């Protein structure tokens, strides 16, 4: 289900084969030309499409472009060398910009930025003021 | 001495049993030793002849080397000869490698690596006897070339015929 | 038909290099093979002879004769006739062994054959191939020499004559 | 003679020493204790 | 699917100045520091791809890929808890002739697929499951 | 059968050209040898032609332009060391070529391995290949003609278009 | 004083080097000893040559033009031929040593103990049973034991020669000649 | 006709199959080079590589060095080459230690500690010997004149 | 840590060349090293000072030595 592309010297390298790799998938209603983050132009297929990239940002950048084409069914995965796959985005099925009941707060401090502790107070502690 | 020596060619009439008084077999691997024994021996066999051949039977028609003394000619000879000599030896060494990899043997094996005269016996009995003769002649030659050199530098060290000098 | 199996094939791919399709059947091939061998053997001796003479060596009683084709033209025919007589006799003597490769004269009166030289079949094939190949080379060689002799007088192209190193012969 | 020391030490201090030191640092920083 | 495969890495968070393993782990379990190319007929990076007659470009031979079928499974596994929360709330709001959470899930996902199910409010779900 | 498959080399002026029928009974291997020889002999000829032309013209800016403008005289003047390098270098390439030939899928004459990207189905490819062959065939005859002129007629320059 | 403790402490303080056999180890004792034994020959040879005037054109300095500033001791002053020749002899030897260190055989005693060398086990074993204060007789002849004993002897001699030379205020070459009976000179 | 295609038919890998990258010539040359050739042992691989690199290195030093015009120029050139070989050998040793570690198992894989050590040794012998060969050759240069 | 910057896990676990660069330039900021107590800090600083003093004296010794052995003071 690979989109039609002729190849580039800006594709993935060894890290994709020995450390980690990424993959995005989407469905289209027409064959159209899009610009790939790696560099160049490609033609998507009329239906399912799969593409591999080396960075999550590269994948999410393409998603932005896809939204312009009115495609909002994209999914991003991380494939480890052993074959293990992790579903990353949309994580809970709902885009992050939309509040979804069932999501808990993380890394939240209940005070204004100016209420953090003084650096000297936490000296020889190992923690930082913003983590204190 | 190493046990394998008991099952190898080399012991004969003048040496009924394994000769390794200092048990060098303990240190040097048995295989490497035989390979080296033959290599140094075969080369020595050729040297002995070369030590006197130019003197006794004459020299080629050239003036690069004027002396006949075996040692002196080494420096008189043009360097180009020496370079080509190293090259030919390298070629020989390569041949032994490639042919050995083809299953052939240059150490008394079943399939000869170099038998241009086609005189390698088929029967194992004769083969064994043939190998023994080569080893002997080789050992004798090594001793001889050493002797020649000795008398050359330290006169009287060895009983060498005058012509051989 | 397929003479690739025959000794002397150019190589595994080309098989028998017969550009003009002289050979058609085994019968013809045998004819051609016999001829090639004969010419080859004759040539091998010829090159040896030409070189020996051109370089200067002469038999007792032949110290004033010239060398090369010039000899054939100048030397007395009477002293050349012996060659024909000694060759014609051989022509009659050599006897081809039936059911054997062309050029096998094992059936000759005097003992002739692989004798002690060859043991295995492979050894025989090798010696045979070498005889043929060396003959092929000489055939070209003797021509090359004669031609150049006529062209410039230098039968060896790069040097006038050979110098031999025969220690024992001295 | 001490006079020969300049010609015996300088070659060592400026060439041998720096080399070995750099090698050791590389081996030290490329090792994962 | 081992949902902790990524978390199970050699990374050890430091005291101060580190966000941590986050949600999906901070580093790949595997070490990128593998060797270079090897002679024909040999392998280097463990489960590497044989370069055949071009060992020099072996690293360009892909061996890591995503199976579309397998892709479905990873989607379901990593979003299992979310689905659970969703159906639970639907159950809490007095479902019409409710049966079993799982049963309801199957019915509700039989229609509206699965992705659509994950993106629907309990209200919409109840409307959908009115029947 | 080579005759039933060959496409390159057959052009318009004469079509298939074998008046003496030197390829009637030859097998594919022999025919392959012939095509390879044809191309090699031709390609070398083309190069030789260019070399002769440049030297004759006087554009031989090497060795302080010491060597003669006559191409055949110059060869004699060239030191042997120069010739040895030439033969040995070409010999090296010949060895590599043999390796390529052994590899499966070898198309007689292809050392760049263009078979990997293009086949004879493409007309553009076959046409361009034909141009190499045709020019090579002509060059072969030309180099033979020029040598005659230089060795017998006595000239090593154009005696055809020189008269404006 | 127990020797063993000191060695252990060194290993602890400098573990990385100790792993390869560097420092106060049997390996070092063997190798350094071998070199000292060999040197004695070199030093005696130098003495003989000096006394018998064998070295060609000694007491003369190499040309600063043929050779370079590398041959200068101070300013334009250059090294004498004798010292140069002695050095070249040593360089011949050092080259052999470098080859042996960088390109060891499969049945050779490597300078450092490498787990990936086939002789590692034998070397480890030999070293494990070669330690003592007194030479172990009964293992005379060509044995590892004899080698170590002779090596220690040679190394001690070097120390003694230097000391005696200083006490008597003489060159080491002179002391050598003296201990031989004045034969060389 | 397109002479440039995606490498290994993977449109997303960062490489392309150009005539330079994948031609019979390039493939043949690289396959038979000592580094990638099939069958060569680690030692032999190093030896061939060393023999090749040592022969061409004596030139630069001998003809352009500080003592080029001296009668002992060639000798000096040889010594300089040996010095460079030693530096390169140190590098090889250090690289192996860091890249491969301390104990190995696979064996006969240029990419292991034991194999690398053997490779390094071969390089040293070949390089130094090759330089010596050049010394002998450059001592007397043939004019190839009849 | 198990890498070059033993005093910093953060730098030690870095997959780039920064690990080496920063480790060298953050070596003498003993106060920020992982697991540093005030007592240890003072003790290490005191010892480091002894080393600096030694370097200063070695430097002075060299000047005297070289002037005496290769100079023209007299
Ligand atoms: C080309 C033909 C040819 C000719 C014209 C001669 C002519 C001669 N040879 Mg002669 N020879 C020839 C070929 C020829 N040889 C060949 C091919 C050989 C090799 C077998 C010899 C071997 C030979 C010997 C061994 C002797 C001669 C001798 C002679 C001389 C007297 C002939 C003889 O034996 O007593 C009639 C005479 C000048 C004899 C001679 O001159 O006495 C010293 C003599 O002893 N020849
Ligand atoms: C026309 C030349 C010629 C002549 C006169 C002889 C004559 C002789 N050969 Mg013979 N031989 C010849 C050509 C000739 N052979 C050739 C060309 C070959 C190679 C095929 C041989 C191979 C050959 C062998 C193998 C043997 C002889 C043997 C003999 C002797 C019995 C006899 C003297 C026999 C002999 O007595 O050997 C000592 C013997 O065993 N020859
Ligand atoms: C204190 C340090 C130091 C010393 C002692 C030298 C010494 C020398 N340099 Mg130098 N150099 C240095 C630092 C140093 N350099 C630095 C830092 C640079 C970088 C800018 C250079 C760049 C440089 C260049 C570009 C050149 C030199 C050259 C030379 C040589 C010229 C004299 C001569 O006779 O040449 C003639 C050479 C000889 C007689 C050969 C001498 C034998 C060699 C040196 C043996 C080396 C083996 C050595 C042990 C291997 C090292 C192993 C490793 C573990 C350290 C001389 C040996 C020239 C030369 O010829 O290099 C050899 C030259 O072209 N140098
Ligand atoms: C190296 C020489 C050489 C070789 C090997 C070939 C080989 C081939 N040519 Mg060819 N050709 C050549 C030169 C050569 N050509 C030249 C110079 C011309 C220009 C006139 C042509 C023009 C030509 C045409 C127009 C056609 C061919 C074709 C062919 C192929 C089929 C015909 C055949 O089997 O010929 C067999 C030929 C040989 C086995 C070798 C040639 C015979 C040698 C050269 C004998 C020398 C004769 C000659 C008169 C020598 C004197 C030259 C000069 C002194 C006057 C075959 C692969 C046909 C083709 O491509 O079909 C696929 C085709 O249509 N050729
Ligand atoms: C490996 C690199 C290399 C190097 C260093 C040289 C070096 C040289 N080549 Mg050479 N050459 C090379 C590769 C190389 N070539 C290759 C790959 C080819 C093609 C096969 C040639 C073909 C070639 C020719 C045809 C000639 C040279 C000539 C020369 C010499 C220039 C003139 C001279 O002797 O002045 C000092 C010089 C020694 C010329 C020569 O020696 O004539 C005097 C000459 O005529 N070369
Ligand atoms: C493809 C056709 C062709 C070819 C192969 C040649 C080849 C040649 N011409 Mg030529 N020429 C041509 C067409 C051609 N000419 C045409 C169409 C004209 C008319 C403008 C000329 C006019 C011409 C002159 C006036 C001269 C040449 C000369 C030459 C020779 C020197 C090479 C050079 O640099 O030329 C340039 C060379 C053999 C030169 C020559 O013969 O040198 C001795 C020369 O003086 N040519
Ligand atoms: C970068 C420019 C440059 C160049 C070309 C030179 C050139 C030279 N310097 Mg110099 N030098 C330079 C910068 C340069 N210098 C700088 C910046 C300094 C200040 C530090 C010096 C300081 C210096 C000193 C102190 C000395 C020299 C010396 C020398 C000479 C000795 C050459 C030598 O041993 O190299 C050895 C070279 C090599 C071992 C390798 C050369 C590179 C190879 C040939 C590249 C091959 C690439 C290949 C073609 C790729 C394709 C391969 C494929 C076909 C298979 C030479 C004339 C010495 C001398 O006598 O002066 C005349 C000397 O004593 N230099
Ligand atoms: C060589 C054996 C005999 C040498 C001899 O007799 O000396 C006698 C000669 C003495 O040649 C000297 O040359 C100088 C410079 O020209 C001087 O000017 C004199 O000519 C001369 O006295 O030695 C040589 O020069 C030839 C030896 C060349 C060695 C070949 C290289 C072998 C590899 C060397 C690298 C070793 C490092 C590891 C090896 C793996
Ligand atoms: C203080 C202390 C202790 C101690 C101690 C003691 C006594 C320590 C003393 C150690 C001592 C004194 C060790 C001598 C070494 C001499 C060597 C290595 C000579 C090498 C010589 C070599 C390598 C020879 C080289 C040459 O051949 C070459 C290279 C070139 C030739 O031209 C010339 C020569 C021949 C020169 C205790 C009590 C034991 C334990 C306690 O806990 C700590
Ligand atoms: C001593 C010395 C010097 C020297 C020197 C010396 C000896 C130098 C030696 C140089 C030498 C041997 C160079 C050798 C060159 C050989 C070549 C190209 C061979 C090509 C083979 C090919 C294509 C094979 C093709 C095939 C055919 C068709 C049939 C098929 O079936 C199979 C197959 C077999 C594959 C110098 C020159 C370095 C100068 C210095 O100063 C002094
Ligand atoms: C441009 C080009 C090319 C290339 C060229 C080149 C790059 C060359 C190089 C070359 C080289 C670079 C060569 C080398 C050589 C080397 C040698 C030849 C060596 C030898 C050695 C020896 C022989 C031995 C030694 C030794 C040893 C081993 C040790 C002991 C001692 C002795 C001495 C024995 C060609 C033409 C292909 C084609 C076109 C392109």
Coordinates of N, CA, C and O in Angstrom, one line a residue, chain I:
Chain I
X1 N 27.7 6.8 37.4 CA 27.5 6.5 36.0 C 28.5 5.5 35.5 O 29.4 5.1 36.3
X2 N 28.3 5.0 34.3 CA 29.2 3.9 33.8 C 29.9 4.4 32.5 O 30.6 3.6 31.9
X3 N 29.8 5.7 32.2 CA 30.5 6.3 31.1 C 31.5 7.3 31.5 O 31.8 7.4 32.7
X4 N 31.9 8.1 30.6 CA 33.0 9.1 30.9 C 32.6 10.1 32.0 O 33.3 10.3 33.0
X5 N 31.4 10.7 31.9 CA 31.1 11.6 33.0 C 30.6 10.9 34.2 O 29.4 10.8 34.4
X6 N 31.4 10.2 34.9 CA 31.0 9.5 36.1 C 30.2 10.3 37.1 O 29.4 9.8 37.8
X7 N 30.5 11.6 37.1 CA 29.8 12.5 38.0 C 28.5 13.0 37.5 O 27.8 13.7 38.2
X8 N 28.1 12.5 36.3 CA 26.8 12.9 35.8 C 26.1 11.9 35.0 O 26.6 11.5 33.9
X9 N 25.0 11.3 35.5 CA 24.3 10.3 34.7 C 23.6 10.9 33.5 O 23.6 10.3 32.4
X10 N 23.2 12.2 33.6 CA 22.5 12.8 32.5 C 23.5 12.9 31.3 O 23.1 12.4 30.2
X11 N 24.7 13.3 31.5 CA 25.6 13.4 30.4 C 26.1 12.0 30.0 O 26.3 11.7 28.8
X12 N 26.2 11.1 31.0 CA 26.7 9.8 30.7 C 25.8 9.0 29.8 O 26.2 8.4 28.8
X13 N 24.5 9.2 30.0 CA 23.5 8.5 29.1 C 23.2 9.2 27.8 O 22.3 8.8 27.1
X14 N 24.0 10.2 27.5 CA 23.8 10.9 26.2 C 24.4 10.1 25.1 O 25.5 9.6 25.1
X15 N 23.7 10.0 24.0 CA 24.1 9.2 22.8 C 25.0 9.9 21.9 O 25.4 9.4 20.8
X16 N 25.4 11.2 22.2 CA 26.2 12.0 21.2 C 27.6 12.4 21.7 O 28.0 11.9 22.7
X17 N 28.3 13.2 20.9 CA 29.6 13.6 21.2 C 29.6 14.6 22.4 O 30.6 14.9 23.0
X18 N 28.4 15.2 22.7 CA 28.3 16.2 23.8 C 28.8 15.6 25.1 O 29.3 16.3 25.9
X19 N 28.6 14.3 25.2 CA 28.9 13.6 26.5 C 30.4 13.9 26.8 O 30.8 14.2 27.9
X20 N 31.2 13.8 25.7 CA 32.7 14.0 25.9 C 33.0 15.5 26.1 O 33.7 15.8 27.1
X21 N 32.4 16.3 25.3 CA 32.7 17.8 25.4 C 32.3 18.3 26.8 O 33.1 19.0 27.5
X22 N 31.1 18.1 27.2 CA 30.6 18.6 28.5 C 31.3 18.0 29.7 O 31.6 18.7 30.7
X23 N 31.6 16.7 29.7 CA 32.2 16.1 30.8 C 33.5 16.8 31.1 O 33.8 16.9 32.3
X24 N 34.2 17.2 30.1 CA 35.5 17.8 30.3 C 35.3 19.2 31.0 O 36.1 19.6 31.8
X25 N 34.3 20.0 30.5 CA 34.1 21.3 31.0 C 33.3 21.4 32.3 O 33.1 22.5 32.8
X26 N 32.7 20.3 32.7 CA 32.0 20.3 34.0 C 32.7 19.5 35.0 O 32.1 19.2 36.0
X27 N 34.0 19.2 34.8 CA 34.7 18.4 35.7 C 35.0 19.1 37.1 O 35.0 18.4 38.1
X28 N 35.3 20.4 37.1 CA 35.7 21.0 38.3 C 34.5 21.7 39.0 O 34.8 22.4 40.0
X29 N 33.3 21.6 38.6 CA 32.2 22.1 39.3 C 31.7 21.1 40.3 O 30.7 20.5 40.1
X30 N 32.6 20.8 41.2 CA 32.3 19.7 42.2 C 30.9 19.9 42.9 O 30.4 18.9 43.3
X31 N 30.5 21.1 43.0 CA 29.2 21.3 43.7 C 28.0 20.7 43.0 O 27.0 20.4 43.7
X32 N 28.1 20.5 41.7 CA 26.9 20.0 41.0 C 27.0 18.6 40.6 O 26.2 18.0 39.9
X33 N 28.1 17.9 41.1 CA 28.3 16.5 40.7 C 27.2 15.7 41.4 O 26.7 16.0 42.5
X34 N 26.9 14.5 40.8 CA 25.9 13.7 41.4 C 26.3 13.2 42.7 O 27.4 12.7 42.9
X35 N 25.4 13.3 43.7 CA 25.7 12.8 45.1 C 26.9 13.5 45.8 O 27.9 12.8 46.2
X36 N 26.8 14.8 45.9 CA 27.9 15.5 46.5 C 27.4 16.1 47.9 O 26.4 16.8 47.9
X37 N 28.1 15.7 49.0 CA 27.7 16.3 50.3 C 28.7 17.4 50.5 O 29.8 17.5 50.0
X38 N 28.3 18.4 51.4 CA 29.1 19.5 51.7 C 30.5 19.1 52.2 O 31.5 19.7 51.8
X39 N 30.5 18.2 53.1 CA 31.8 17.7 53.7 C 32.7 17.2 52.6 O 33.9 17.6 52.6
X40 N 32.2 16.4 51.7 CA 33.1 15.9 50.7 C 33.6 17.0 49.8 O 34.8 17.0 49.4
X41 N 32.7 17.9 49.5 CA 33.1 19.1 48.7 C 34.3 19.8 49.2 O 35.3 19.9 48.6
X42 N 34.2 20.2 50.5 CA 35.3 20.9 51.1 C 36.6 20.1 51.1 O 37.7 20.6 50.8
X43 N 36.5 18.8 51.4 CA 37.6 17.9 51.5 C 38.3 17.8 50.2 O 39.6 17.9 50.1
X44 N 37.6 17.6 49.1 CA 38.2 17.5 47.8 C 38.8 18.8 47.3 O 39.9 18.8 46.7
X45 N 38.2 19.9 47.6 CA 38.7 21.2 47.3 C 40.0 21.4 48.0 O 41.0 21.9 47.4
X46 N 40.1 21.1 49.3 CA 41.3 21.3 50.0 C 42.5 20.5 49.4 O 43.6 21.0 49.2
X47 N 42.2 19.2 49.0 CA 43.2 18.4 48.4 C 43.6 19.0 47.0 O 44.8 18.9 46.7
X48 N 42.7 19.4 46.3 CA 43.0 20.0 45.0 C 43.9 21.2 45.1 O 44.8 21.4 44.2
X49 N 43.8 22.0 46.1 CA 44.6 23.1 46.4 C 46.1 22.7 46.6 O 47.0 23.3 46.1
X50 N 46.3 21.6 47.3 CA 47.6 21.1 47.5 C 48.3 20.8 46.1 O 49.4 21.1 45.9
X51 N 47.5 20.2 45.2 CA 48.0 19.9 43.9 C 48.4 21.2 43.1 O 49.5 21.2 42.5
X52 N 47.6 22.2 43.2 CA 47.9 23.5 42.5 C 49.2 24.0 43.1 O 50.1 24.5 42.3
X53 N 49.4 24.0 44.4 CA 50.6 24.5 45.0 C 51.8 23.8 44.5 O 52.8 24.4 44.1
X54 N 51.7 22.5 44.3 CA 52.8 21.7 43.8 C 53.1 22.1 42.4 O 54.3 22.2 42.1
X55 N 52.1 22.3 41.6 CA 52.4 22.7 40.2 C 53.2 24.0 40.2 O 54.1 24.2 39.4
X56 N 52.8 24.9 41.1 CA 53.5 26.2 41.1 C 54.9 26.1 41.4 O 55.8 26.7 40.8
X57 N 55.2 25.2 42.4 CA 56.6 25.0 42.8 C 57.4 24.3 41.8 O 58.6 24.6 41.6
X58 N 56.8 23.3 41.1 CA 57.5 22.6 40.0 C 57.8 23.6 38.9 O 58.9 23.5 38.4
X59 N 56.9 24.5 38.6 CA 57.2 25.6 37.6 C 58.4 26.4 38.0 O 59.3 26.6 37.2
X60 N 58.5 26.9 39.3 CA 59.6 27.7 39.7 C 60.9 26.9 39.7 O 61.9 27.4 39.3
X61 N 60.8 25.6 40.0 CA 62.0 24.7 40.0 C 62.6 24.7 38.6 O 63.8 24.7 38.4
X62 N 61.7 24.5 37.6 CA 62.1 24.4 36.3 C 62.9 25.6 35.8 O 63.9 25.5 35.1
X63 N 62.4 26.8 36.1 CA 63.1 28.0 35.7 C 64.5 28.1 36.2 O 65.5 28.3 35.5
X64 N 64.6 27.8 37.5 CA 66.0 27.8 38.1 C 66.8 26.7 37.5 O 68.0 27.0 37.1
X65 N 66.3 25.5 37.3 CA 67.1 24.5 36.7 C 67.6 24.8 35.3 O 68.7 24.7 35.0
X66 N 66.7 25.3 34.4 CA 67.1 25.6 33.1 C 68.0 26.8 33.0 O 68.9 26.7 32.2
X67 N 67.8 27.8 33.8 CA 68.7 28.9 33.8 C 70.1 28.4 34.2 O 71.1 28.8 33.7
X68 N 70.1 27.6 35.2 CA 71.4 27.1 35.8 C 72.1 26.1 34.8 O 73.3 26.1 34.7
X69 N 71.4 25.3 34.1 CA 72.0 24.3 33.2 C 72.2 24.8 31.8 O 73.1 24.3 31.1
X70 N 71.4 25.8 31.4 CA 71.5 26.2 30.0 C 71.6 27.7 29.8 O 71.5 28.3 28.7
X71 N 71.8 28.5 30.9 CA 71.8 29.9 30.9 C 73.2 30.6 31.0 O 74.2 30.0 30.9
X72 N 73.1 31.9 31.2 CA 74.4 32.7 31.3 C 74.3 33.6 32.5 O 74.7 34.8 32.4
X73 N 73.8 33.1 33.6 CA 73.6 33.9 34.8 C 74.9 34.5 35.3 O 75.0 35.7 35.6
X74 N 75.9 33.6 35.4 CA 77.2 34.1 36.0 C 77.8 35.1 35.1 O 78.4 36.1 35.6

